[PDB]
Design a binder for this molecule. Structure first.
Ligand SMILES: O=P(O)(O)OC[C@@H](O)[C@H](O)C(O)(O)COP(=O)(O)O
Ligand SMILES: O=P(O)(O)OC[C@@H](O)[C@H](O)C(O)(O)COP(=O)(O)O
Ligand SMILES: O=P(O)(O)OC[C@@H](O)[C@H](O)C(O)(O)COP(=O)(O)O
Lengths: 123, 467, 467, 316, 151, 123
């Protein structure tokens, strides 16, 4: 009977309960994103990697959900290399940030993909 | 100056027996009948009562030094042995005005009567009287209306008021309750009433009762030309439910509601009294449960204390016994608290059990209600003991008449006006009581039939509570 | 079928003494200790109690025929003479469920205890017990929280809870009250409390007290790491004022309020209990004024009846006596009503004064509070008589310690954990009581000093109320 | 958007036993399930306010527990607090305390509570930012038999109109009836803006919704880790998969039980996203995960042989 | 005393078929007309109805040990075959008073009729009658007026 | 006259005002727990050893009351060694945590026992 850990066990939504993604696996999720014709975009955050409540406590309000946008959504992108390329450029500019890849479905205006792609050391 | 603090228990008499004390006019004074356990001396017994009902505890505490205990402590200032009794004394205790919350009968009792009756060192304890200082009396509203205003609103002067309790106590339906009400009222009675335990029950829900009784009372009023009233019981389980019932009585436009102040409580009673003052409703008070506290002479609280507490909290009528009926009530002691309920000033008078002189600074008077096992032959005694300012109620005495309610009411109304006329003419109700009633039977077939039924009913037993 | 109506008075026994009756599971049963006047036989005395507390009056009324009295009448179904007493019996009366308003302790008492104690034909009367049927128990909310929920909210398990009443009773200012509160709490006591008579008075107004006590309790909680509470008294003169105080306690976020249920009243208490359930406040109940009603064995109402009434109306704690302290309370009778307060089912057991088997259909239990003249040497007896589910309060026993409040609290907290550890280890608190305390004095200078002060204090007198 | 959850079905869990737990014990079981990776825990449909656990004590302890699990994991958590009650007044009282605690979701039994009370709560939830989870308790009394009653698709349409953010829609593969085609038919009527007539799925009329938002279908009832690939395949990302016995029945407790379900699901999402066929490689995907998840492994052992297969009463 | 916890699914009849049970006067009793699927025996069909309408689920959970299930569980205490019908029985289930919210017909139905009619293991199910105990009847207001008052 | 300390005097409910428990004393409380037929269980906490109020201030609400469960309640346990054994295993896995032993009475569903069994250094 194993006891599930308590310390240093922050998680990051979809796919963070699986073993770390190798670069092939990462590339495969971006392919899935592009194959479905969703628009990719990257977001990064250095200060508040996790949700918290500082300005309000009413139902549905949380601080820390919005991260900052890296450049612009890559409309018309079709080459996963282009996406992975931006990831590298962002990483080098913000080595201290959590970075995630999201994909928009403009038709339903819902993000159909969202997963952490890079985490600072210590995490 | 801050004498030191020394832990440890010491006699209560060292701080709370103060025989040299002169009472202040703002002090609440109390007369306790104390029966100490063997080996506990009067002074300590009295000091212990004064101590736990005010500022002290069983052992010395250091905090006493943060205040001026001399000004807050209650104190046993006089002890007088009880004649003919062994090991029984009347200890007088004075409590400073600063110990009580203004306008709260609940707080007055929590201090003076809160824990002292259960001391292991006492065998029995009884509170006989309280002198409520005029400075404390003014912090209370008192009766919502009082005797003068009530007579003025109902347009009734010159004779006691007549009422009747519907029977059986419980079990009648709402339409049947109203039918019995209309018949009693049209016969000459001024009021009919819910019995004290009629609230809202499976057999008859309150709103249906209030509604049918309003139709009945309005019908009897139109038929007779005299203002009628039916006491609607607002006693309930929560303050919220009590207010709901009072509010519907206000909406129906009826003149009087009723409350059981001891089973309901002083906190709920004060709320209703204030509501009644604000909405023009007369408030009739029942003392249900009083004999559980005031019957025995050696332990409890006498009724005069509970009567004073009601005049402060608020009520326009209060049941006060009959003397001659089925429930206990001695004549002298009764006349004593009837005066404390109606008058503005009553002087000390031990022959009637009044231990302190009491002033009311114009707090209106409460109308005493004689009810319980009385009938037409008791009419002269009742008119003589109570006088014009009282309400005489006949439940079985109306609904037990052989011809029904209307004739039953006429019987009581005729018997009473006969006594009022006789008295007013100079006749002595005490000596000519039966002649007056007998004379009336000659022209009142209704009175006549009632006389036949109850000719031999008397309730005579030795009393438990005597001066 | 409608036997005729015949006016006139007849014996109560003809209709209300029913020795063949089999009680229904929905009947409210009552055990009265009746002392008739000479010449009045048991059957009639009992029938008269059953009659006036339910449906009948002193003379035959025609309206009985409009209903089915057989189904509403209360009835004396069994009489048993009292051993060793002359002319004293225990009469059992059964009252049908339809006579009571759902959820109203006020209505239950108005019928069963309203007028019967004052009958001229009885010398004394005492209500010993009531069997409240499960169908009536469900119409009540019961405690706002109860034992399980309270321990869960405060995070306290495995030992009695410790509290302390600030002293002197009256006279301290609001800032001084809070200072004494902070010091007691930081020493290890779980709760401090307003004394029962501390409401709002010239020397200290309620809102200033509530405010300063909140600052003090929050400070002690931050210092110790244990949840603390201070009972804020909401007792007041009107329902309106009582609610105002409860509302500010809710706004401050404190965990517990307090009410004097008998001086405040059942109607006001039920309102506060419902409010506490709705707002997450624990409710501590004081029985101020109970000994005026329950001390004497021949007249009154026993405390077990008033304890049952409180579990129904609502309260999370209720004062239940100490047995060994300054106020009356015999061990067996006490253990009897402590079971009626905490358990879900208690079987009939005359050795403890329990006349009827009582079920509670999961109505939560009430925590009994031992308070009144107790000190460190009483700790083993208290832990042994009451067990883990109780609150032990030491007012003079904390504020009377020679070194002040904090050390006074440590003394009581150490004495208690010493007894809990010893008991848990197998030691016999009854025999090793003083050894356990004495052993602790070897490593607790605080306990040691308290032991010195109260070594010789005991309260031993004959009891008035015995089985 | 409010919960910040995208790319996979949402995971929930019903606390058990249905009735009987105390308020502090309910919160203890809630904290443990949430910290293991489940997004939501919930009151069972019949947990309202009862002698063993009163509602206000439950709401209060569950709030402490959910806030603790949220701080530990970094993911937004929710616990459906049941507002179903006997009167409209009592229902509103419960919704109001949920709003005061700041929790994100309440729950209502729309058929036993009623449409009149449900519409009132739905409006209140819109006005106060509360998500509303709907239970269909009592539906099979009306929709089971093919010859008399009302089909569930009609009751599902009625709920999307009256109002609810989630609605129980069956599992197909679990302990309660639900055929695949008919289920996929009303799941479309619940989530999409337009569904064309299609008798093969029991849809008799073409239905348009003029942008009325979609309702999230909730699969709950007798499902476990081995059903994960079928569930992800039948329902897709927009659904809530609930495991009551499937979490509280894990041999190591609630936290490990939650990890088991969260790992099994992310494994299926990754596999699907990579191109694998969940229908054919279902068991391989789960089996592969057991190699690096001791938690999943233990759950697989317990339920390996549990299936619920009986003929259906309601067919096209 | 806390028998151990052993994960896994077991027959409902082991805990919820209790033919020896004497019903209490505070119990809500139910008469269900059950039609089981072929291969599912009456006792299990009835036990399954009693289980999901009260305290149990499809597999063993450890939390049962934090309470006293014996006092909360609903239980199938009697089964009687239906005359002239094949594979149809009347199963009687008793539910303890503590399972219901006072004054809420909504809660009574959510438990007794909430999910059981949709079990894959049953073909049809019908609730024929309920014995509402007087202790539960008193928690309701009932008709606003009733026959007598209305007339 | 001694002045009761103010600093570093946090306490931990039942038994924390007594001198530290020797291992015999500890074993004796576990025996008491088992003799009464209550179910033991261990709980541990590394972050918030004490009650506090971060998410709400209404009556009866406090944060920090729930600790995390070590394994599962030991239903059917009858040997105090088994309990003391888990204590050691937990201590070695969470040397930085406060750990406490609680015991359930399933009949009343109330914890009839609760006491701190291990504290991190500095405490
Ligand atoms: O007035 P108290 O002493 O309080 O006593 C109370 C009685 O008055 C009581 O209300 C009564 O119902 O028994 C009177 O009925 P009846 O008129 O038929 O005798
Ligand atoms: O508990 P009851 O029997 O109702 O009696 C009431 C007493 O407890 C009372 O509250 C007290 O103030 O006298 C206790 O103070 P202390 O702790 O200093 O003795
Ligand atoms: O979803 P529906 O078909 O309405 O059916 C309702 C079920 O989901 C029901 O809520 C449950 O309690 O039986 C699920 O528990 P478990 O997860 O332990 O199986």
């Amino acid at each position: 009977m194993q006891v599930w850990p308590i310390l240093n066990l922050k998680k990051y939504e979809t796919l963070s309960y699986l073993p770390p993604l190798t670069t092939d696996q990462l590339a495969r999720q971006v392919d899935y994103l592009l194959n479905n014709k969703w628009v990719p975009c990257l977001e990064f955050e250095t200060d508040h990697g996790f949700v918290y409540r500082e300005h309000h406590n009413s139902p549905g309000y949380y601080d820390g959900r919005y991260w900052t946008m890296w450049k612009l959504p890559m409309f018309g992108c079709t080459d996963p290399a282009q996406v992975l390329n931006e990831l590298e450029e962002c990483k080098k500019e913000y080595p201290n940030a959590f970075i995630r890849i999201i994909g928009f479905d403009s038709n339903r205006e819902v993000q159909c993909i969202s997963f952490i792609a890079y985490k600072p050391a210590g995490y | 100056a801050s004498v030191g603090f020394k832990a440890g228990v010491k006699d209560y008499k060292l701080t709370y027996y103060t025989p040299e004390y002169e009472t202040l006019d703002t002090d609440i004074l109390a007369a306790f009948r104390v029966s100490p356990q063997p080996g506990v001396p009067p002074e300590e017994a009295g000091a212990a009562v004064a101590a736990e009902s005010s500022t002290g505890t069983w052992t010395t505490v250091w905090t006493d030094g943060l205040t001026n205990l001399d000004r807050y402590k209650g104190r046993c200032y006089h002890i007088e042995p009880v004649a003919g009794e062994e090991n029984q004394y009347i200890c007088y205790v004075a409590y400073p005005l600063d110990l009580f919350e203004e306008g709260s009968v609940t707080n007055m009792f929590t201090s003076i009567v809160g824990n002292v009756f259960g001391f292991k060192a006492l065998r029995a304890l009884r509170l006989e009287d309280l002198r409520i200082p005029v400075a404390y009396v003014k912090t209370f509203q008192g009766p919502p209306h009082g005797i003068q205003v009530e007579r003025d609103k109902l347009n009734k002067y010159g004779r006691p008021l007549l009422g009747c309790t519907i029977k059986p106590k419980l079990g009648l339906s709402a339409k049947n309750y109203g039918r019995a009400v209309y018949e009693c009222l049209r016969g000459g009675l001024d009021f009919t009433k819910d019995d004290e335990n009629v609230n809202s029950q499976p057999f008859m829900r309150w709103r249906d009762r209030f509604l049918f009784c309003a139709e009945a009372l309005y019908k009897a009023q139109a038929e007779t030309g005299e203002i009628k009233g039916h006491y609607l019981n607002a006693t309930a389980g929560t303050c919220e439910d009590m207010m709901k019932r009072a509010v519907f009585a206000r909406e129906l436009g009826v003149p009087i509601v009723m409350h059981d102040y001891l089973t309901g409580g002083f906190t709920a009673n004060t709320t209703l009294s204030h509501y009644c003052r604000d909405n023009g409703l007369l408030l009739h008070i029942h003392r249900a449960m009083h004999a559980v506290i005031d019957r025995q002479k050696n332990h409890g609280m006498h009724f005069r204390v509970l009567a004073k507490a009601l005049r402060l909290s608020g009520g326009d009528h209060i049941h006060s016994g009959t003397v001659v009926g089925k429930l206990e009530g001695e004549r002298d002691i009764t006349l004593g608290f009837v005066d404390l309920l109606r008058d503005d000033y009553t002087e000390k008078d031990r022959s009637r059990g009044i231990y302190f002189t009491q002033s009311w600074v114009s707090t209106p008077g409460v109308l005493p209600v004689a009810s319980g096992g009385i009938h037409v032959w008791h009419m002269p005694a009742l008119t003589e003991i109570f006088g014009d300012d009282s309400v005489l109620q006949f439940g079985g005495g109306t609904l037990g008449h052989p011809w029904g309610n209307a004739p039953g009411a006429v019987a009581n109304r005729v018997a009473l006006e006969a006594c009022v006329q006789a008295r007013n003419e100079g006749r002595d109700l005490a000596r000519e009581g039966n002649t007056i009633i007998r004379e009336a039977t000659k022209w009142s077939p209704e009175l006549a039939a009632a006389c036949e039924v109850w000719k031999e009913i008397k309730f005579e037993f030795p009393a438990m509570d005597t001066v």
